[PDB]
Amino acid sequence: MKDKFLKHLTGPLYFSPKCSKHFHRLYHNTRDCTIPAYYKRCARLLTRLAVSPVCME
Amino acid sequence: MKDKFLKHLTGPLYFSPKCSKHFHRLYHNTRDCTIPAYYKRCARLLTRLAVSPVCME
Amino acid sequence: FDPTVHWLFTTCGASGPHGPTQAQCNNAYQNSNLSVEVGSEGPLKGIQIWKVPATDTYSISGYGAAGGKGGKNTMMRSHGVSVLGIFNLEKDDMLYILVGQQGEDACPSTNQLIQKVCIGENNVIEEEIRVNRSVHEWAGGGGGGGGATYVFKMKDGVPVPLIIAAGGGGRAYGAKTDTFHPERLENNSSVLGLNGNSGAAGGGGGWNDNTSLLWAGKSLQEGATGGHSCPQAMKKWGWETRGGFGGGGGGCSSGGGGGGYIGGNAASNNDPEMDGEDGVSFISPLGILYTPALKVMEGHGEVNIKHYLNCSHCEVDECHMDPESHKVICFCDHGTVLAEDGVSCI
Amino acid sequence: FDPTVHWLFTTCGASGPHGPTQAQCNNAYQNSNLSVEVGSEGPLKGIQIWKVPATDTYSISGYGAAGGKGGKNTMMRSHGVSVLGIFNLEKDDMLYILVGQQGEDACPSTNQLIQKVCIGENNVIEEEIRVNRSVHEWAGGGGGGGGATYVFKMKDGVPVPLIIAAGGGGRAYGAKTDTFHPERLENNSSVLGLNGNSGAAGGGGGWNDNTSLLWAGKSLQEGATGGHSCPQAMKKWGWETRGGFGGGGGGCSSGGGGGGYIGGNAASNNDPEMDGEDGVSFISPLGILYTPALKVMEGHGEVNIKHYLNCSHCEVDECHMDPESHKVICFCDHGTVLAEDGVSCI
């Protein structure tokens, strides 16, 4: 109801330890992922982090 | 491609012989159903004509 | 007559409770077949004046404006009504056309305190409803009523309605459904075109009435300016949802009433769940009702005027024009098929 | 410090190529914890000046604006970039914050001749492309570039950038795809903040450059006003797609370039398929890059400033605040579980 909802828009994306460190910051410290109404924005952020060069190793 | 596209949004609604006279007008003489970009508007029109009291007899 | 020639009247880019200016309509109609005159003062301000190019039978399609949305942008707004009519117009007749403007939505808001309420991060209204079952302090959040579209003429200086396509009512703040009422249409000119009832929110403006309340939409003959929001909403946090131009009623915690020949009603109290009602559409006895009044428009209203295709040349008085550069195809009822004659089906 | 206290900077309701006025920001920030000063003239016009309330470590999140849409409203617009930074700010420091405004969309248009092109009922551009494979007369239809968001300070008169979140480029008229480029980020201040290349459409405005072309977005230190549309579109049919405030490049048949530290480029010719490039984001060496530059925003940009949660007290420097009114929770990497001490991981 609070995490699978984002996954329905983002998808089962993979992460690395540095990718996970950035994922935590994007997940708990930004209004995009901490305000439910902004869920779409959150999705985009996560999606972009998936294709970021740090996670692309 | 030209008629089933409307049906995918409005649904397979029923009509009466009195309902058909208005349906033809709304389908060929209005700008909503004769301009493809306005398809949604066309759908609404048709939908409303389905619930109009003349077609509810 | 060229079958594809039509004149399309829009809001000229104007929005909100006031109509377009002359410059706005000159800019919107640049490089088109349409040139209108827009009054700048008095009750005719914002109303486009068009000159009929030839004496002929014209189909006039009026579309009213949709109402505003409520506090949560998840319920579909009430759509403005469309009325089709057939009229006989002489050359150099002046048509007065008011294109109804959409009622303002509660959300989003440029004010950040209201924007917090919009995104669900401020629930003072919910707490007030839970501890009082009535909104008295945190009023606001209902959409304004949509403006109606008026096509009329000036006989001896007195306006005479031809087509009135009602505007949609505004959605309430706590609109929990999307049920919409049947479209009301008036064809008898002896029925008075009065304003809608005003409670906390403003009722829609009518064809001809006296408007005193600021949140009620004005009637057509006194300007048809959309009403302001209820004073409580403006005093507490400045949550303004004005009615659309064309008699749209201003919003409150309840939805505003849409404009029309008869203005749409508003809830007597400040019910945060009662939507505004759409106005009553009007078709003049001087014209033929082509199609029934139907709720279509999702934004501003419009007017489309074209030459009426004479379908009385074939046995069925219904016909159309084939889009792929062809001739008039007469319509066959039920399951009959047009014969080789092309004037009668069998 | 209250963990929930934050200051949110918006466009104050302003839109288009120019920034908000003082009255607009006073209206947007009414009944909030935020009060800014907006310049009314000169290169600082439209830029909000904020006073730092206390000397502390602040997290500043900048969001650039999205670019405009092309001729067909079926391709998603290029999203503005978000840059997160951690800075140490002294009390009574003045932060200059330009919130980038969205680049204008080609469609819909209040002009009816253009609106015919928007709804697919006018194909002069398609015939022009089929006959010449290049648009020279019927220019126009590409979105303007989105404006960038700038957070900076006036260190001894010379402006010193802190956070620059790039604006998205405008989409071309005939954008047949939705591929978007990786977000470029600049952290070295010796790299010049130049404008983007301008062709038929305007390149994005940079941080410090000289702008001569009217369709190019201005740089931050000369106003950062969004550029006009290319002269050909305005002269042919007045199809205006201006760049957003914050250095957004004006549109043409090709898309405009977004603003940034380095402005986004535009196609050298009037290619109706080449979108504008997003700008280059900037993070000052005086601050710590919190999260990478990511394309998020679909409309106007924004700034969010809050107190940085100091979390060097637990073993892992990364932490968060529990939303359900609880204490600070330090997070553990991989599969390690939080120890009973609440500091280390095991």
Evaluate whether the domain defined by D311-346 bears CATH number 2.60.40.
no
CB nearest to D291's CB, from A26, A34, A44 = A26
Do chains D and A touch, with touching meaning 3 or more CB–CB pairs less than 8 Å apart?
yes
What six digits make up the tokens of C336?
């009959």
Cα–Cα nearest to D207, from D257, D144, D161, D265: D161
What is the rounded CA–CA span in Å between residue C301 and residue C11?
A: 7
Q: How many Å apart are CA D130 and CA D107, to the nearest integer?
A: 22
Contacts C122 to A, Cβ<8 Å = none
The position carrying tokens 């007559």 is C1
Give the containing element (helix H, strand E) for A31: helix A31-34
CB of D121 within 8 Å of a chain B CB? The answer is yes
Contact C112 D10 (CB under 8 A): yes
Chain C residues in contact with A37 by the CB 8 A cut-off are 119-121
Nearest by CB to residue C304, choosing from B17, B24, B31, is: B31
Report how many Cβ contacts below 8 Å link chain A to chain C: 8
**Residues with Cβ < 8 Å from C14, sequence gap 6 or more?**
C20, C21, C24, C46, C101, C245
CA C218 to each of CA C150, C257, D100, D241: distance values in angstroms, whole numbers, following the listed order: 13, 11, 38, 36
**Domain locations along chain B:** 4-56
> CB within 8 A of C36, min separation 6: which ones?
C9, C25, C29, C48, C49, C50, C97
Q: Where are the domains of chain C?
A: 1-308, 311-346
Asked if the peptide bond before residue C17 counts as cis, ω within 30 degrees of 0, the response is: no
Spatial distance between the Cα atoms of D244 and D160, rounded to a whole number of angstroms: 22
With beta carbons less than 8 A apart as the criterion, state whether C243 and C147 touch: yes
CA distances D260 to B38, C156, D158, Å, are: 38, 62, 18
Residues 18-47 in A contacting D (C-alpha not used; CB under 8 Å): 20-22, 24-26, 28-32, 34, 40-41, 44-45
The Cα C68–Cα C217 span in angstroms is: 14
CA distance C248 to C260: 9
Residue by residue, what is the 3-state secondary structure of chain D?
A: CCCCCEEEECCCCCCCCCCCCHHHHHHHCCCCCCCCEEECCHHHECCEEEECCCCEEEEEEEECCCCCCCCCCCCCCCCEEEEEEEEEECCCCEEEEECCCCCCCCCCCCCHHHHHHHCCCCCHHHHHHHHHCCCCCCCCCCCCCCCCEEEEEEECCEEEEEEEECCCCCCCCCCCCCCCCCCCEECCCCCCCCCCCCCCCCCCCCCCCCCCCCCCCCCHHHCCCCCCCCHHHHHHHCCCCCCCCCCCCCCCCCCCCCCCCECCCCCCCCCCCCCCCCCEEEECCCCEEEEEEEEEECCCCEEEEEECCCCCCCCCCCEEECCCCCCEEECCCCCCCECCCCCCEC
**Cα(A51)–Cα(D78) distance, integer angstroms:** 16
Residue D183 CA to residue D281 CA, distance in Å, equals: 8
In angstroms, rounded to a whole number, what is the distance separating the alpha carbons of residues C17 and C23? Answer: 18
Chain C residue at shortest CA distance from B55: C292
Q: Is C335 exposed, middle or buried (0-12, 13-18, 19+ CB in 10 A)?
A: exposed
Name the neighbours of C, counting chains with at least 3 Cβ pairs within 8 A: A, B, D
Hey, are the CB atoms on C120 and A36 less than 8 Å from each other? Answer: yes
Q: How far is C9 from chain D (nearest CA, A)?
A: 9
Quoted resolution (Å): 2.3
Report the residue of chain A nearest C117, measured CA to CA.
Answer: A37
In 3-state terms chain C splits into helix, strand, coil percentages (rounded to 5) of: 10, 25, 65
Q: What is the b/e burial string over C300-318, where b = at least 16 CB atoms within 10 angstroms of the residue's CB? A: bbbbbbbbbbebeebebeb
How determined?
A: cryo-EM
Residue A27, exposed/middle/buried by CB under 10 A (0-12, 13-18, 19+)?
buried
SS3 at position C196: coil
Adjacent-strand bridge partners of D85:
D60, D289
D110:C238 CB<8 A: no
Residue in C87, C82, C43, C37 with CA at minimum distance from that of residue C62: C82
**CA D344, CA D346: separation in Å to the nearest integer?**
7
Phi–psi pair at C174, nearest 5 degrees: -95, 50
Environment class of B47 (CB within 10 Å of its CB; exposed 0-12, middle 13-18, buried 19+): middle
- In terms of phi and psi (left: phi > 0; alpha: psi -120 to 50; beta: otherwise), the region of C16 is left
**Residue found by looking up tokens 């309509």 in the block:** C25
Shortest CB distance from B24 goes to which of C82, C321, C331? Answer: C331
In b/e form, how buried is each residue of D252-272, taking b as 16+ CB within 10 angstroms? Answer: bbbbbbbbbbbbbbbbebbbb
Rounded-to-integer distance, Cα D239 and Cα D107, Å: 10
